[PDB]
Design a protein around this ligand. Structure first.
Ligand SMILES: [Mn+2]
Ligand SMILES: [Mn+2]
Ligand SMILES: [Mn+2]
Ligand SMILES: [Mn+2]
Ligand SMILES: [Mn+2]
Ligand SMILES: [Mn+2]
Lengths: 300, 298, 301, 303, 300, 300
């Protein structure tokens, strides 16, 4: 018996995946979030882990599925797995913006239910709660939210806002930490109601679904819409996400910068764009003027 | 009974990975490479699948491992798995450029041995055939190659050339197909010997290890070196690779284009750059003026 | 006797306006449209004059109103386009069209000019809500042809196709004008929709006009630069031309965004069209001008 | 009678024009120019309305004419700018100015409206050749101040400096307006000259306006983008604004040409000024807007 | 006497200068100009060496002086090396000058021709130029005084003397008509409307104009924008800046011409391309008409 | 007897050259370096004149040879005029060389210093460099032979000899010039190396010089535009300046590549430096000119 004979498909898969193992699980675990700041990690697609200065851990739209695996729409997942859901331990809330496939995940739910404390709430619109209960998440552990609702999870004020009786289907979140606010728009198309939120709230960092729409499809925000969003929200930082995940939606985030450069002076834009990378951290307000993220290079 | 009880870490992994399942395996199998052309797929890192007009399938530097998975170099794999090694059926040759971790793989060796024909050769330098034998690959089924050697796998003429003692450890490949030619530089630094190869051979498409070097390290070629490689090799297309794989080497391939734009006319560059994406197909010479690859949009 | 005493506001206005007088009227009237080509003029806002190789004259969305003229939301709605064409100097005309009932697309004075100065058989083509506006003004109901998405109207060698318009049926229509020279898509003031792709599959489109502009914070009324590119892709056009961005002060946009994005996208997305930055009063000739990228007014020396 | 039958060409014109009506007139009337600042409006072509902190109104090169209105130097020059200001709605004014007697810089109707609607002590300031043209139109002799280079005219709190122009002291002048808020350089329609350096050395110039345009093949009547930058340097200005490029179809130009060259040269040449791309009817305020780079009209909509 | 004692300033100078020696002298002499073409070299400043397919050698504005060499009114230093040795000139068929100004007519060059070359080589220039040549010692019998309108035939090259704009006694412009194509040399002229007159009455292939960064309150050179206007007026196919090489205080960026051309070419339907040359370099019309930028031979 | 026959080739050469005369010599000598600052001049190739606040004068790699002067492996032609006259040098404190190659050491410079300058002026360089100096007749006692690690004090300037890159300790060293006003890295003709990071950590480096150039096909002899930026990061400089690209026609490169690449990477890589494009004969004042990006000759 040699390596060539003993190894099978499953032995390879189960020793290789997820790609990052629990590296980021540990990174988030040991991250000390300074006062007057908040830290966040891009988990792929619209997945965001949020950590407040008080050590509060919040997880939004964390998705661990894949696209097509066979020929038996050619959406192929182009983002690796930067966070193992089954390595999560310290978490204080599990959120979903809407019930679309790649925003809510049974495996994430399964992991939290098996490994984490029983007082972790699952927060989302009715349709997401219906979907969670179906997977076996206890009723009493789910908080249904509508636009207008505010949910206090430790030191994080979660503001449920309008997405675009649809209150049952989708919501946007505004996370208010003692160090800054974060806007998560899920997979919303651009809407004028972004302006409402900008007038009614102080928004620091804002995330919006960027992506290259295939011919005859309007599923993602364009580079021009990302800018309109930042302006409407009166944000300081505008970060594209969702553009990472789907082969057919492969987009160039640099378009947001190039357009921003043409328009910022003329329109008096009060924000900067920021190109992130999946698995990457962001600290507000430290990283607000960085423009472009880079992974840790050296060994410092 | 309920899914938040029946699902385990293990079942989730066995359900989700590799991310593309067998889509690319099936696409490569289905591909009808037209005469006068060759087809090519990027499999992450320096991993290339090549299919000639005569349907000859060749796999170079196919790597199916990962980077760091725990805290106790911060190299994290940033590329998903686009090809299932254990789904490979039709293959004519498995090749490796060198014995470094990122270019040779035990599971790929295992897969080809279990799933494919018994006459499929494992081609690489002495150090590479050693590891293959050590893993369980037959001694006689391996072909040891050094610079100067020429191996003919059906209609593909494989030229083992100089890489950058050394002769036992690393080689560059020039795959001459009837449709065209491909230069696989492995993980070589820039060398003046590229000019020797460009003189002595017709090179159509050239691949070079691109990446953003950390402060105090020279491990990957720069954007300027990519263009110098294209010139020295007298190539018609210059494609970066390797920059996809490691987080800490995350580079911008657009630097190649911008510099090309500045230098092309002055220096009479005979080539064009191409920015590829992992799992993507490239067809010489149909895609030579494309500049940037996009995935099928459906 | 002296000018500072004789000249009045009325005498100045009537001596100066409209700015181009009947220059463009004259130019259109004597333009010899070659066989295999069609020629068109931009009349401001969404207003287009089309002339086929058989000399058929069609007028779409020709607006001759203005913005705000005083301070007494109070929109900073100010017209930033001069009047390139005198409606009352129109003689040769075979059809008068309107995409929708909105202020910027339908005009009383244009209607009056065709009834006073033009043939008694010139059709007023438009949606149900537009003909009700025409008739109410004094247009004979027998002149009007009420069109619906799917309707086709033959005006000599110009084959007019009424198509779907976009907002959130009786209110609005898009137009496709097929000529022995080529086709022209007129989206009016439509938002971007997936149904552009329908039109691109069902018909061949050569030149596509898109309502472009800079949306005020919290408004969505004009298409973005990225939308203009998606529109040209969906319609399988060869030329994409912005319009409507000229007319309103508060919607002042830079058409160069379209080109800059196009340069970034063209190869990766394999666009089969080129953008074209036009100027009001300007003439386009398909396909002579398809690769020009930018229009320039006659320099004349 | 119906609307279609009753409405004539005349009635359409009477209610439609000028395009902006009296909107800008009212904006200028109500504008409370803050101390330490000055406000100015681009009236089209080289037309500038200037309002000091002390409420002094000054109108320079106001042209309410048009180009070719028919086919009939055979020149296809068509007015590409709408009318932003009604001259007949002007009520509060302290002085009417003209740089030179050229067609696009002096207007019979502007003189007529001012003579009819404004106080009889309002001066008409310009070179000899301009006052000759004004006198002929019916403007009294008593109401004109003839200026040659070197002359200084005090109009309330605005020191107006008639400086050298570039093709005769009788024909053309450049103005430097000194307000308590800042200084404004109006070069009229001068081609680039070396004598801008003299003015730059001898005077503190804040905002410089230069006649920009795309010259037709074999004609040299307007400044290039490169000329625009050399002016700002020579004048030692802080802001450099192109004008005159708005008005003529055949002279249609891209102002961004000035910005792009500036981005190539600013560091190497150590430029102390910034370019600013303005729009007709738009207000500029010194020094508040000096760094804005590009103007946009009020976008409105707060709901 | 050792080397640190035997070496003098004068011995070093004679051992080093001119920098290029006779390298370019040798290349011009050995140049096989193919039929239907013409080859030209940039000798520094406005110095042009023309060679027709019939082997005819013409030399325009070849200057071999230098700028300021001490402090005891502009600080003009020569920033160009010497690429051609005037005293190595063998084959020549004409010597031309555009105007009296020092940077365009040379004593040492005139001398070198009178000593090394044929006794029937004409010295063609305006009235003021021949006055200097005669004064220096060139026979009145070998000087062709040209006015705008005059046309001198030198073998297969046809020299058209046209109006200058830097006065018919003082300066002229040249249009060199060869079988292979025409070359417009504008000397040190600034932009003028009379450029259009030359474009209408002749076909211009390559146009050379005096480019430079004008010092504050100085107008002595053409701007990048003026170079394009010249190209348009002359109806050229290739526009090449020169003169911008020679003076420290006039140092300019020829890339301005390219950048502006990129913005304007389509809108103004330019029928020419700009071309950035280097001193000592070779241009071959029409082979190099689409090269945009010259590079020196890299060898090997 | 007139000018056309009295003038010889020697008459022209000895009156015209060196191009700048003693213009730069005078500027250097009259230059009053302010406290907290240092001034330097680019003498062509890798030649640098350096002047501290105390008035010390250091001459590094000053070359006065030239390229090919006739056709009788490469077409290397000097594209730079001579900006300094070695024989006009009076006030000097030290003469330095980085390595023994032709382009970096000159006998005429040695001779001029030996004949015209003080007796106690040391010739500092690697072992092979002092061999050539001794071989040219410079006293053995007057030469300081250096290897990596050695530190030589010259008035207020502390010269640090460091490693050069292709032992090599015989042939080549790199210099760090510590002045009371700031430090200067002179990499000489080194290829890119990781040991730039070593020097970066050990020393504070303010201004960095690197041998930029356009390598011909199949030759790696000069640093690329990307290498220049990498050097800046490794040395942790605040100013990165290309040189050596000026001197050979073969290696004609555009230093703007450094800037363009810098504009793309600076924010992503948190570059703590700026590129500065110099001109031969130009002055640089650290820290006055640190933010300039591009030098221009005095326009006057
Ligand atoms: Mn989604
Ligand atoms: Mn590797
Ligand atoms: Mn509208
Ligand atoms: Mn004028
Ligand atoms: Mn000169
Ligand atoms: Mn060297």
């Amino acid at each position: 018996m040699s390596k060539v004979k003993s190894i099978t498909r499953e032995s390879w898969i189960l020793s290789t995946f997820p790609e990052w193992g629990s590296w980021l699980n540990e990174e988030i675990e040991q991250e000390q979030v300074a006062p007057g700041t908040f830290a966040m990690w891009w988990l792929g697609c619209t997945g965001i882990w949020l950590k407040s200065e008080g050590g509060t851990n919040v997880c939004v739209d964390f998705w661990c599925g894949t696209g097509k695996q066979s020929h038996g729409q050619p959406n192929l997942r182009t983002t690796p797995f930067v966070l193992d859901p089954f390595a999560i331990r310290q978490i204080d809330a599990v959120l979903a913006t809407h019930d679309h496939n790649d925003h809510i995940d049974v495996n994430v739910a399964a992991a939290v239910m098996q490994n984490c404390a029983d007082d972790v709430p699952f927060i989302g619109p009715k349709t997401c709660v219906d979907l969670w209960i179906g997977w076996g998440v206890p009723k009493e552990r789910c908080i249904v939210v509508k636009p207008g609702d505010v949910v206090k999870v430790k030191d994080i004020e979660i503001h449920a806002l309008d997405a675009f009786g649809m209150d049952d289907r989708a919501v946007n979140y505004l996370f208010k930490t003692p160090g800054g606010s974060l806007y998560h728009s899920g997979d919303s198309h651009y809407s004028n109601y972004y302006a409402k939120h900008g007038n009614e709230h102080q928004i620091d960092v804002a995330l919006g679904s960027y992506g290259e729409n295939p011919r005859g499809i309007t599923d993602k925000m364009t580079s021009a819409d990302m800018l309109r969003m930042g302006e409407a929200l009166n944000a300081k930082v505008v970060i594209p996400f969702h553009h990472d995940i789907w082969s057919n939606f492969q987009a160039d985030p640099q378009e947001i910068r190039v357009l921003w450069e043409m328009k910022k002076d003329r329109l008096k834009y009060g924000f900067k764009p920021f190109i992130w990378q999946v698995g990457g951290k962001f600290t507000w307000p430290l990283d607000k003027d960085n423009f472009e993220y880079h992974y840790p290079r050296g060994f410092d």
